[PDB]
């Protein structure tokens, strides 16, 4: 499996696009609510401020976190290799098989 650092990096990226999807959804609801606000019912007027504020705060911190990720790219620089040992490990397992062949009491 990959080293953990890459794991939380990909988790943060996934959070980033989920936040972008949430921003698009909230844009959909604010566009929806503005229609009836133009229609002329004032009951949903208080919800408009909350929706706008949450939309803007969702737009800002997502870009901020992505900026942090791109910054991490800046200092992460400088921080078949398996083949060099690959034959060796193959060697090992083959002899292990011979051991299983060599002992008739373990072939069950």
């Amino acid at each position: 499996m990959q080293p953990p650092y890459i794991q939380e990096r990909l988790k943060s990226l996934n959070d980033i696009e989920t936040q972008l999807c949430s921003m698009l959804q909230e844009a959909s609801q604010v566009t929806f609510i503005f229609g009836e606000l133009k229609r002329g019912n004032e009951s949903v007027k208080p919800q408009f401020e909350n929706h706008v504020k949450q939309f803007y705060e969702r737009l800002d911190k997502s870009t901020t976190q992505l900026r942090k990720e791109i910054q991490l790219l800046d200092e992460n620089v400088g921080t078949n290799k398996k083949a060099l040992g690959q034959d060796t490990e193959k060697m090992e397992e083959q002899l292990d098989l011979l051991s299983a062949i060599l002992d008739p009491s373990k072939s069950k």
Binding site: L37, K38, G40, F48, E49, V52, K53, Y56, E57, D60
Partner: protein, 136 residues
């Protein structure tokens, strides 16, 4: 005549752009999406410029009075004259805004001022929201 000349040249280039987008859509194979977007945006902004310039010079167009040429023969070209003379809209747009008005349907004036205050309030609210977070 200067205003109508500018209208002429701009509408001619708009028609040229329409002919362009036409003969690149008429091909049996659709080009790349990006070229279509570029053509769409260019032609559509050109239509915007057409609308704005036609708006600017309404007085010159209105002042002009239409009259057929003495040399132009109407006996043989009456069909051509009637073709340009007619101005009634295409019917589908007509019932289109008829259904639109049907759906839409001192009271009207105070709703109008209520819309004014909602517009101003929303503009101020979004100005405040933009000012809340530093975007630079």
């Amino acid at each position: 005549g200067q205003a109508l000349d500018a209208v002429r040249m701009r509408l001619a280039q708009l028609t040229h752009s329409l002919r362009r987008i036409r003969d690149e859509m008429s091909k049996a194979e659709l080009p790349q999406w990006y070229t279509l977007q570029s053509q769409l945006n260019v032609t559509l902004s050109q239509l915007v410029s057409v609308t704005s310039t036609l708006q600017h010079f309404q007085e010159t167009l209105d002042s002009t009075v239409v009259y057929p040429l003495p040399k132009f023969p109407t006996t043989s070209h009456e069909s051509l004259v009637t073709t340009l003379l007619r101005k009634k809209n295409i019917p589908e747009v007509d019932e289109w805004m008829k259904y639109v008005r049907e759906t839409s349907g001192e009271e009207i004036e105070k709703l109008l001022q209520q819309d004014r205050e909602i517009t101003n309030w929303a503009r101020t609210t979004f100005r405040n929201e933009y000012g809340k977070h530093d975007f630079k």
